[PDB]
Amino acid sequence: DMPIMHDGDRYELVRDIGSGNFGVARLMRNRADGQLVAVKYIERGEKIDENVQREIINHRSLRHPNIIRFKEVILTPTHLAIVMEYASGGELFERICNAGRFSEDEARFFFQQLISGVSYCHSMQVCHRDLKLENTLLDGSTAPRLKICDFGYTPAYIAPEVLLKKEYDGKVADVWSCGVTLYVMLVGAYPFEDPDEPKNFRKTIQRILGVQYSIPDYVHISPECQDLISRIFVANPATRITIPEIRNHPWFLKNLPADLMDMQSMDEIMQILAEATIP
């Protein structure tokens, strides 16, 4: 369930949705600025706990263009409403499918945004967070802004060490994921996974563990691009290229935009969350 529509003076109801990265959510248009927002609802009472509070505070702290940004919490008679930015250009993956594959320059356009967002997320973490890299979103149709869904309310993406080791560095596993996104942009399909046997997980995992992939002969990529890919897809996390090293890689640096180079008070939010614990 979702409660009835509310705050109609500030928001227009666009549509209630039931799937995708926002799950069960309400899409709204802000009447003041015209921006689309996704609203998630949590029932008032026992569900409003310290986890919710931390998730909200964490979310709120993320101020970077390539992350889905928190807007506000609103108290309703029956639910806490969590309002955040909505990405209206679909999934990155669907844009790749539509294109067949991206050119090197288009892949770079998105990869620069991805890495920048991931580097930002990493800089704000005390612990690894599932950034949902398998499903990044796009905002806008033309020159789309990539959106990572750093919030929470195919096995091709899993790095070898995530399967094999008791302990692993989550940031280094994210590098592998970024490489999987780069590959799918350049090739038009996932590496490792058999396109005719997508649910043969065992087969995909054995290929991950062996780092068994190839870029098709008809896909021509520059040496700098090959260099980046080869340095991401190494099984040993200790030898994998790091995010700072990617940010200084010549393929990443080429055509880097100037921007990528180099609200309620917390008091109000906390008071709303406190009130929301009462049904």
mmCIF file of C-alpha atoms in Angstrom, residues 7 109 129 140 179 259 269:
data_model
loop_
_atom_site.group_PDB
_atom_site.id
_atom_site.type_symbol
_atom_site.label_atom_id
_atom_site.label_comp_id
_atom_site.label_asym_id
_atom_site.label_seq_id
_atom_site.Cartn_x
_atom_site.Cartn_y
_atom_site.Cartn_z
ATOM 1 C CA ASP A 7 0.756 17.948 -0.328
ATOM 2 C CA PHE A 109 31.020 10.187 -21.638
ATOM 3 C CA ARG A 129 27.401 0.015 0.319
ATOM 4 C CA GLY A 140 17.290 13.282 -19.519
ATOM 5 C CA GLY A 179 34.648 -2.443 -15.842
ATOM 6 C CA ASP A 259 33.082 19.882 -13.769
ATOM 7 C CA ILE A 269 14.257 15.856 9.684
#
